[PDB]
Amino acid sequence: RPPNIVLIFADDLGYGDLGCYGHPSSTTPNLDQLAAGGLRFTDFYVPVSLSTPSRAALLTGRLPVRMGMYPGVLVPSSRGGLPLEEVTVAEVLAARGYLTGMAGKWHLGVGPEGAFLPPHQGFHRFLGIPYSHDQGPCQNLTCFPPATPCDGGCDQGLVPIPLLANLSVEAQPPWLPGLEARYMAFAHDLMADAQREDRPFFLYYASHHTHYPQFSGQSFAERSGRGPFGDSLMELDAAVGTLMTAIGDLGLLEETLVIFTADNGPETMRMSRGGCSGLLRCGKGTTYEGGVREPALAFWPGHIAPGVTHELASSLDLLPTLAALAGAPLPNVTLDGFDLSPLLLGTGKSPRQSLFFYPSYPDEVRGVFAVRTGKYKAHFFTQGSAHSDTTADPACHASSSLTAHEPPLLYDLSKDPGENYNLLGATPEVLQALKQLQLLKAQLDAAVTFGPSQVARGEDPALQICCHPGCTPRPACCHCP
Amino acid sequence: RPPNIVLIFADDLGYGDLGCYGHPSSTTPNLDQLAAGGLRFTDFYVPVSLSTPSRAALLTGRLPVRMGMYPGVLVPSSRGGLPLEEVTVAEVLAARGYLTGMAGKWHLGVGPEGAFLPPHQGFHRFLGIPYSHDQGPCQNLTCFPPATPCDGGCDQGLVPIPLLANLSVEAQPPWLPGLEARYMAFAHDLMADAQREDRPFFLYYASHHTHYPQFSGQSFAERSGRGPFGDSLMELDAAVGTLMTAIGDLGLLEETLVIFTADNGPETMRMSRGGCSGLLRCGKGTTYEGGVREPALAFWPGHIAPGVTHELASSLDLLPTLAALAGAPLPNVTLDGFDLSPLLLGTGKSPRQSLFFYPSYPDEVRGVFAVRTGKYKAHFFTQGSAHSDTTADPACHASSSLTAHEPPLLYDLSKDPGENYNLLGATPEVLQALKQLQLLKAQLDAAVTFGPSQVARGEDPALQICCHPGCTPRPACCHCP
């Protein structure tokens, strides 16, 4: 029987942040235990370094330009959304009779009467926030109890952040120091109800950690020894421990696949309240390894043996691997990932040879920015980003504008994961890798047509969720805490 | 009974190079296994980022300026050396009847008739090279068999690199692809002879890995997937596995303490043939965390439980911890380290609160460059270094000259291990940390007097070891391969 699947997706968490990936001061003991008894990926990626596009690619297994999830991210007034025609993972498992649930951040659009919310995209249950938790004013929110306010205020002129239950506003805004319990409790109930109906569950846990502003419940506040980013990562980690215990308590260890990853690199613009890309260069917002190479853990006792692969994998491969593993069939669409079960089960290698990376602002004349094949990565274009400012590497800053590279900047990621030493700027291994990387970009660029942008369809403030429909004056009247 | 102690010391190996410290492509499975069953330090340091000074501080537990081991490092023609009056670790254990042995790099001086070599400083046995393996021409040496030459040539106009056995030249130069077996074999014989005389051994294994030029025996050549730096680190790692097996085979697991660390940060000047400081800044040659924060593993089954401490420790603390653990008494000199056995055995905390860092070129008007207390590190002076050139961080380059900082640059290493965000440039926690850091530098600077420099005592080419004493023309006639 198809296994129970729990998929945890962190926010803005970098390759250097878990203790098991090197950080000297993070406290993440549950995730360190998953790694110890599971497969830890050294080379897993997402294809775009922002929340919306990355969340689209994970849920559909498709490159976000194919369905319009560019440029940038969706906002609360956004008209647009992940089109209802896309088939998400949830649709695929639900059809094979999984009881499917989602807690936490959606960021795939809201729309006219909530048309784009999770309940329309295959989730049976949903408790969470429809976009990112800083997309609403937070100067008066508490981030750390008893009364430590969130820092900097978040986005102004907006409705406060709403917690939803299917399409209804449960709270607005919610109490950040208690979000976690709400989500643990929703998770526990979905497990148990699934067990009791004799059915596999799919839990999609999109945490708010470790996105700005940082918050945690009172057990973690000031307990990690890495300040607010730490406390917030310790809570995420504790949360994981909790789901693992609940998996315990219902006798489901050997019957559940648990995967952890994160949507994109760290926001170093938040300085020491933001993540760490460890040795990789830059972060969120860029196509350097720091923004697109994420941590990734796969645990299934008695199916996946403890270890470390260096094989290539993407968040784009998760739909196809989970369909395979649950005996569900694939949507009838072009998919950009592959099944990795041979790699997970130890019977094979990853089928993936190449990875393609688009910028925050893609366009059809430039096409893909970077391509990785085997050990080699070519950058055809480079660009820094405000989400990665403040570090000492100047190629990460927003003042490093869009620069073309012809011939591309060429790195051997197995000896230079750091992306410091351009091999062109000329061996037969190299030149052969160069002609391949050039042919693969020209091939994808001639074959992908960009789906018309959802984000450019505009904003309308009337689309903001409001607790007290009709009230006045908007947006501040919208609120039922 | 005092335990058998094996102390492994790598060369130019950074905080980001072991697989267990985060590297995505290194292959170090034996050391990853030590960490898994031992205590892994996140915050262990050396006090000076070069080979000579660091090797002096480990062996005596004293700050290298106290006995003249500055500026820079010793060369083959050097007149000077670690003074014979210093009491090394080897002296301390030998006196309590350890059979003491050393394999690999000395770099503590040679001198007129080998007066400063290991056999005069407490080692019963010694097989190794009296300085660094690139300090002699290597354009004709093989680094990777069957016939891959060492890269770049090393130092010219010198006698070739000599392999010594006590004070005799065994080979000149030696066959780099076979150094490891020679050293494994010497280690095995010291174990066994110690077992058979009913006595504890002390093995001091100073590896040549991962110093330039890189080399390995034919089992590792081209096998790691990180190129020559990898192959060379895989061999070091395999070597460790071997000593662990020999510890197995003579029934000595529970009776031996094995420690691994490294003398100083990575030489990023060798680009992708050099190490990785992971998230820390810069490398070898500097007083940034990248040059002085090393990996460190302590393993003793049934004495030290598996885990991770964040407590402060230094290479300066090893003499005193090993004396304590062997019931030997301490030299009657000022020591700058502490016993850490409570921390190793789980009964206590590190006594160390503060760490002091000197530059490659110290001087008495400037005094210590940086000071760490608790979580805070102050830099009073900063300076880049040619050994750390070629990265994107400009503070590491040799073009970043000696700059004073008053008030000092102040970092909170628990949230900013990266040393990116200066907290001055002003909370009560901060200001209190600032007055302490200032008082501790002024205190050490008024109390340490610099021992007269050994390195300035000059060079004399007649002090170069020569296989064929008297031959002509020197240096090329010196050679018996």
Ligand SMILES: *[C@H]1O[C@H](CO)[C@@H](O[C@H]2O[C@H](CO)[C@@H](O)[C@H](O)[C@H]2NC(C)=O)[C@H](O)[C@H]1NC(C)=O
């Ligand atoms: C809102 O919608 C879902 C789906 O109806 C609610 O669904 C569940 O509610 C009860 C148990 O949780 C039962 O009445 C229904 O069996 C159940 N439906 C399914 C398909 O499981 C759910 O409670 C709400 N979502 C959440 C948890 O917020």
Ligand SMILES: *[C@H]1O[C@H](CO)[C@@H](O[C@H]2O[C@H](CO)[C@@H](O)[C@H](O)[C@H]2NC(C)=O)[C@H](O)[C@H]1NC(C)=O
């Ligand atoms: C050179 O010096 C040491 C010390 O004499 C040699 O010592 C050992 O040699 C034999 C066994 O290894 C025995 O003859 C002696 O017991 C022994 N001495 C001690 C104190 O162990 C040694 O072989 C040489 N050093 C090496 C290994 O190069």
Ligand SMILES: [Mg+2]
């Ligand atoms: Mg994000």
Ligand SMILES: [Mg+2]
């Ligand atoms: Mg060195």
